[PDB]
Design a binder for these strands. Structure first.
Ligand SMILES: [Zn+2]
Ligand SMILES: [Zn+2]
Ligand SMILES: [Zn+2]
Ligand SMILES: [Zn+2]
Lengths: 201, 198, 201, 198
DNA sequence: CGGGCAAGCCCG
DNA sequence: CGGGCTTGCCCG
DNA sequence: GGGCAAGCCCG
DNA sequence: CGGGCTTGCCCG
């Protein structure tokens, strides 16, 4: 029943950590992350891997949820859905399991379930927590974002925050991480432009 | 027929004219006589002037229909893009279908036509004589998508075709002009006119 | 009937002219008229004397209609009424003879009629023709304008035209004259400001 | 019936803060900590942050009520100007009373009170505890008239009184700040702060 | 009667 | 985002 | 009205 | 891959 989802980082018991590994320096690169600005820059409907870590294994049945919220207060109350244009296109909605309205999708996990809170009307996607893989330090979830930030009728130029939540079976919060998201035509350019705007302060 | 263009004044000489407009960069609308092109903002009231040599038949009307200019695209029926069609911004008002690009404001006797087989869409109003002492009959048009709209007109130029016609359907007058729906009509006109000079 | 009343001057077969007498130059004169800009500057709810003259007198039961219309196309279709504040206002609707909604009222005539066409919702005011008071060139009608142009919720800040129509006993327009209206606190100030501000274009 | 705007952080250390905000001339809102004063654009989303250390009481709710600052006018109820109340521009589409100055934006549990005897207007929401990991409960307010509006607050300032209450209407906590609803909060703030040194 | 200001708003 | 043009209204 | 934003065109 | 331009929109 939580309208206006919290976005403050909260490592919780197990020290919940969200990080970004690959970095492909380019203007029109499928994606990249600005640590300085705590902002992910990503191409529409492209695969992008995010890295999740814990020190101590979370209780059984724990899940990981991703949910978008608007950064600005005026808009915060507005639910982040896909724009009409992209929603109704056959592109990407042709025989998917994911609803057409959802902005965030998970790539490569069939256990992934798409939540439409019946009261708060909020949209999100959850997957069960998996402990890395024996050689590894990270549980890698791979996400898809299905609309550009600029998309008219949808996000319409308005910034969003992506909130990753480590949760119990019932939904209790164990860990939280948030970061700004921008779905772009060209991540590198838009990143550099914003990073320079920060340098020029 | 789908869809005639060539201008034809006729028995009553049908003239479509535009009054003097703002030169402003974001003026709700403007007309370039040089380029025979109307530049107008999305959803803004855009007045057009109709003139005839002789008082026409009683059961006669004026219809406006959009069609793509370029040879490739004429086939395609021009409607509103999905975003604007479904978005709440102007469709909340009862009067016109949300699909139609061209809308008529201020007239209640606005008939929105969807040809049942050649799915062309257009808007018609009964012709009225100018009010006493007046040269022009003014119709108020609204254009409900930007020319640039993706999944709609998608940056493709279109002509607006104003036809004077009988209840029968006989087309006694035809006039047309290029249309562009944009954010900054003044700017885009100026820019075009400069580039016609090249 | 008409939903766009035309503004176009139409001198009648009976030579219809709408005139203004000498107009006090003071900053906040009850009213003043710019012949240069063909616009009256009237104080809200003040006696504003209009001069009307004709070459040949018209048939009996011929009357004069005054109706406000927004000047610009973007607003043309909006009917010109009094703002909510002033309409429901107690401050000027005691001594009530007129509908509180009507912008334009007439002072001194009790044949003064208020038309509220229910077809096109168009508000106007009508009085029967009086051949100029004896020895006079013209007929003096007193108009009152009941809202400031700037009035919010009403005609807020949007210019208007006033259309005086020389009408036959049953409808037919015999002559028409229009002029811009601005209902302000300081007509003199606003007049000068306009006229001066025009003298470079 | 004057509401007690006298402040007391009672049992739980009841306090209201304002997050950091833009220093723009016409920024939707801004707060001068220096002056006990919130500068707000009309009908814009204005977030208030509430913090408590020990929350318990179950039926507890939070109400916001406007009152005039200067004592002469304190007796006068703070309603919306007739213009804005009767107007179309912000009323149809919501389920909040047209007369009330203060509205709550992101909440359906919000209830808009009309004091049967006092005729005072207020808006109450149930106390929601901060979400896990989170410092404060963040209530979204909007203010529906400019301070300057004639027929309402005739340029005369007001205070906003946020009260933490038991479902009986028992003041657990109270905090208050002066409000100014204007077109240009940044400008008015900057100017106001300056016109405080002497 | 005119000068001046507050506070909304528009245009560059 | 300012800077600067409104305008109703108060002051003297 | 100028300048900036941002999807996508072009070589 | 990046420089650049068009067209919407907001502001060193
Ligand atoms: Zn989209
Ligand atoms: Zn569109
Ligand atoms: Zn008024
Ligand atoms: Zn108000």
């Amino acid at each position: 029943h939580e309208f206006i989802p919290s976005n403050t980082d909260y490592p919780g018991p197990h020290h919940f950590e969200v990080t970004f590994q690959q970095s492909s320096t380019a203007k029109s690169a499928t994606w990249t992350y600005s640590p300085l600005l705590k902002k992910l820059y990503c191409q529409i409907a492209k695969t992008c891997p995010i890295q999740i870590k814990v020190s101590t294994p979370p209780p059984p049945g724990t899940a990981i949820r991703a949910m978008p919220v608007y950064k600005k207060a005026e808009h915060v109350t507005d639910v982040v859905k896909r724009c009409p244009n992209h929603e109704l296109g056959r592109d990407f909605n042709e025989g998917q399991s994911a609803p057409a309205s959802h902005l965030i999708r998970v790539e490569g996990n069939n256990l992934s379930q798409y939540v439409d809170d019946p009261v708060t009307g909020r949209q999100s996607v959850v997957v069960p927590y998996e402990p890395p893989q024996v050689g590894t330090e990270f549980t890698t979830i791979l996400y898809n974002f299905m609309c550009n930030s600029s998309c008219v009728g949808g996000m319409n130029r308005r910034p969003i925050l992506i909130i990753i939540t480590l949760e119990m079976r019932d939904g209790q919060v164990l860990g939280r991480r948030s970061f700004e998201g921008r779905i772009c035509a060209c991540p590198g350019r838009d990143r550099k432009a914003d990073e320079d705007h920060y340098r020029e302060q």
